[PDB]
Design an enzyme around this catalytic site. Structure first.
Site, PDB file in Angstrom:
ATOM      1  CG  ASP A  46      63.544 -39.629  18.484  1.00 14.70           C
ATOM      2  OD1 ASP A  46      64.078 -39.018  17.537  1.00 14.70           O
ATOM      3  OD2 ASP A  46      62.738 -39.086  19.271  1.00 14.70           O
ATOM      4  CG  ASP A 230      63.477 -36.325  14.740  1.00 12.60           C
ATOM      5  OD1 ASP A 230      63.236 -37.541  14.862  1.00 12.60           O
ATOM      6  OD2 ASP A 230      63.065 -35.476  15.556  1.00 12.60           O
TER       7      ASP A 230
END
Ligand SMILES: *[C@@H]1O[C@H](CO)[C@@H](O[C@@H]2O[C@H](CO)[C@@H](O[C@@H]3O[C@H](CO)[C@@H](O)[C@H](O)[C@@H]3O)[C@H](O)[C@H]2NC(C)=O)[C@H](O)[C@H]1NC(C)=O
Ligand SMILES: CC(C)[C@]1(C)CC(=O)N([C@H](c2ccccc2)c2cccc(C(=O)N[C@@H](C)c3ccccc3)c2)C(=N)N1
Length: 357
Positions: A46, A230
């Protein structure tokens, strides 16, 4: 002035590739080794959080037992501190809680010691029921850390000085060949030139966004807005306001095998304006078919500190089409995000390079 970078090549063990499996629940998961003896967990990688989460056996909830929980009491390198601290994270569609501990991790034949991480102990808000969640590897900037002295990536770089401060993602779920590269990039995953975008705020991988066009209609921007890269999300996003104005030009609708093929030809072309760079997404790129229905592959997300001025760029609606590189700045020079066309081909990624200068 603008001094450029360069694709200087490194040796094989200086850029390591972590395969990512596209799970049937939209998780892009890799392999991570925890403890001694090793315990294997498959976390998500992430770029929107810096915390290292590991689902442990101290979570006895229903969504926790279905996955490979990590048992700290079977690990010889696990060592909690005398005055144990607690950890709290609240996101949009759920929450995560647990304690803090230090452990030794191995990420693709590289070892890291004294790594502070959070042991997941609770998962109740309802989203973890749809997902076989096992942990999160944090790739955001250190300011986003909830606890710990050094971020996992910073801590890995400190203990393996062969790795340069950069990583890169190549998303391609169909062929199942998506790969996470640490310490550089591989020239076989993209074609053309690589364009850099400076990071405004070292919290998310965030860059200035100058506009968004769905076909010829300007969805944004009337006030200074930004884009966040992201890798923890499948969908692109917009704040609450602009999301309505978007679904009016590209709405969902029932679609058949011969109805979705025509949607891709007539649907508009979305344009993201990053200063001098214009990144376009074609209908076949951001449109998904689910249960005979044409869904714009977008969702609503209000970023906390940026009010209604933050737009996210996800894995399926962007990175699948654009090879993305993350170059960590230092001191005066800023961190930057590199975007290029994804080559979308196997080739032979034995030769790898890194961005210098
Ligand atoms: C975290 O990991 C580090 C290394 O990865 C551990 O090293 C600790 O820090 C140094 C390095 O060995 C040692 O401290 C000092 O070493 C010098 C050598 O010149 C000596 O003159 C000093 O009197 C002092 O010993 C330290 O011994 C070493 N280990 C321990 C147990 O203190 C570190 O231990 C790991 N974590 C923690 C919480 O210390
Ligand atoms: C997943 C959490 C670890 C977190 C901390 C949650 C989180 O806020 N974001 C971003 C994000 C970043 C910045 C501002 C707002 C939101 C985001 C955005 C949109 C949707 C989702 C979403 O529901 N993701 C699904 C796929 C999923 C994956 C794995 C576990 C749970 C949920 C996530 C993460 N990157 N990560």
């Amino acid at each position: 002035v603008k001094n450029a970078h360069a694709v200087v090549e490194q040796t094989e063990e200086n850029v390591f590739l972590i395969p990512l499996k596209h799970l049937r629940d939209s998780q892009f998961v890799g392999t991570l080794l925890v403890g001694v003896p090793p315990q294997e967990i498959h976390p998500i990688f992430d770029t929107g959080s810096t915390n290292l989460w590991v689902v442990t056996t101290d979570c006895e909830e229903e969504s926790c037992k279905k996955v490979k929980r990590y048992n700290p009491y079977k690990s010889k390198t696990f060592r909690r501190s005398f005055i144990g601290k607690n950890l709290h994270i609240v996101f949009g569609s759920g929450s995560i809680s647990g304690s803090i501990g230090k452990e030794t991790f191995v990420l693709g034949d590289h070892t890291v010691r004294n790594q502070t991480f959070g042991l997941v102990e609770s998962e109740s808000n309802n989203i973890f029921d749809y997902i076989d969640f096992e942990g999160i590897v944090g790739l955001g900037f250190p300011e986003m850390l909830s606890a710990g002295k050094v971020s996992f990536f910073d801590n890995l770089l400190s203990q393996n000085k062969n790795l340069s401060p950069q990583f890169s993602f190549y998303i391609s779920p169909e062929d199942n060949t998506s790969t996470f590269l640490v310490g550089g990039v591989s020239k076989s995953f993209y074609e053309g030139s690589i364009y850099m975008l400076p990071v405004v705020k070292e919290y998310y991988w965030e860059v200035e966004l100058d506009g968004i066009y769905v076909g010829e209609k300007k969805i944004c921007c009337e006030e200074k807005s930004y884009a966040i890269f992201d890798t923890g999300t499948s969908y692109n996003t917009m704040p609450s306001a602009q999301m309505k104005g978007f679904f009016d030009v590209v709405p969902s609708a029932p679609c058949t095998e011969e109805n979705y093929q025509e949607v891709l030809k007539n649907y508009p072309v979305i344009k993201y304006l990053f200063g001098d760079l214009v990144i376009e997404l074609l209908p076949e790129e951001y449109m998904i078919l689910n249960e005979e229905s044409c869904i714009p592959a977008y969702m609503q997300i209000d970023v906390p500190s940026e009010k209604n001025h933050a737009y996210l760029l996800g894995s399926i609606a962007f990175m699948r089409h654009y090879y993305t590189v993350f170059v960590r700045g230092a001191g005066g020079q800023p961190s930057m995000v590199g975007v290029a066309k994804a080559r979308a081909a196997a080739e032979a990624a034995q030769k790898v390079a890194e961005l210098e200068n």
